[PDB]
Design a protein around this ligand. Structure first.
Ligand SMILES: O=C(O)/C(O)=C\c1ccc(O)cc1
Ligand SMILES: O=C(O)C(=O)Cc1ccc(O)cc1
Ligand SMILES: O=C(O)C(=O)Cc1ccc(O)cc1
Lengths: 114, 114, 114
């Protein structure tokens, strides 16, 4: 899976080890080995949420499987939780888009996962 | 809804008030309350369009509903017009990707919109 | 088509001419005239892949048509090869997400392609 966080929080406010923590927690939450987890954190962004430039985040989680109604509620609780604790972003200023990819539409290592 | 603009126009050429103007215009166009609209503008990017690095933009608009053939034409007229007037990007050097998201695939405030 | 490369390789490691080379190679690979191809390269990113911060890339290719099982395998070989040769990223540290877009969901020049 792939997890992307775009935020207007400054780079200095992102803890060291945040990328490793995300990797570990996503591995547990999705049941995927950590070897397959990619995480991308984009701070210092020009963003507004509801008209306001208070801290906010726009996120995406792409996976082959492990996406659905109930799992996505679980992931939202986990990820809003981590962003609130570590980046000090309110969970009502977070959107997370979930994408269930087909394996033929994910390239890796000169081929696809199909 | 969420609206993301990626452009090679420098940060200095992005006018004051632009993120608020986009929030207001998108609220008018989509009917959604401004409180739920998120905007993200990414200047200074390394981009080319048709082989040339003249000003250009790559955009996306995600919404739960209010996406479809006729609506998307209207959004394109609106957004290309704003980009041309405020950032001086020609409309024929803009692509906008539209995504109709299922409510169960959008996380917000520790849950999803399902 | 649109091709986006996010990577933790530094800006100075991106060779001169790379955006044009991507444009040319995607035109040949997809069969689309180069006037339609847009490319966006984002270096210097905070990223991890498999828990490691070694060079990696997260990419996406969006097209109207020309997306599918066998075509995506060919694209992956071409694009992993380019990233390996030009940015010295190992192909097993690259993910490429492929998106087949409907013409009604792509805006351009004040309308859509529908
Ligand atoms: O657009 C909406 O219905 C909404 O209120 C929020 C929203 C947020 C993110 C997204 O990708 C789609 C919709
Ligand atoms: O999670 C997996 O199974 C993967 O094969 C890895 C993967 C899934 C979805 C992506 O967009 C990127 C990588
Ligand atoms: O690929 C084509 O046919 C285009 O006309 C250009 C295009 C296709 C898909 C996109 O998401 C953006 C641009």
């Amino acid at each position: 899976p792939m997890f992307i966080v775009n935020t207007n929080v400054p780079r200095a406010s992102v803890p060291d080890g945040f990328l490793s923590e995300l990797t570990q927690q996503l591995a547990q939450a999705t049941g995927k080995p950590p070897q397959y987890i990619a995480v991308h954190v984009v701070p210092d962004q020009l963003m507004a949420f509801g008209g306001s430039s208070e801290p906010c985040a726009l996120c995406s989680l792409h996976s082959i499987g492990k996406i659905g109604g109930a799992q996505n509620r679980s992931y939202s609780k986990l990820l809003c939780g981590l962003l609130a604790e570590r980046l000090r972003i309110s969970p009502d200023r977070v959107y997370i888009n979930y994408y269930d990819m087909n394996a033929a539409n994910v390239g890796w290592n000169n081929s696809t996962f199909a």
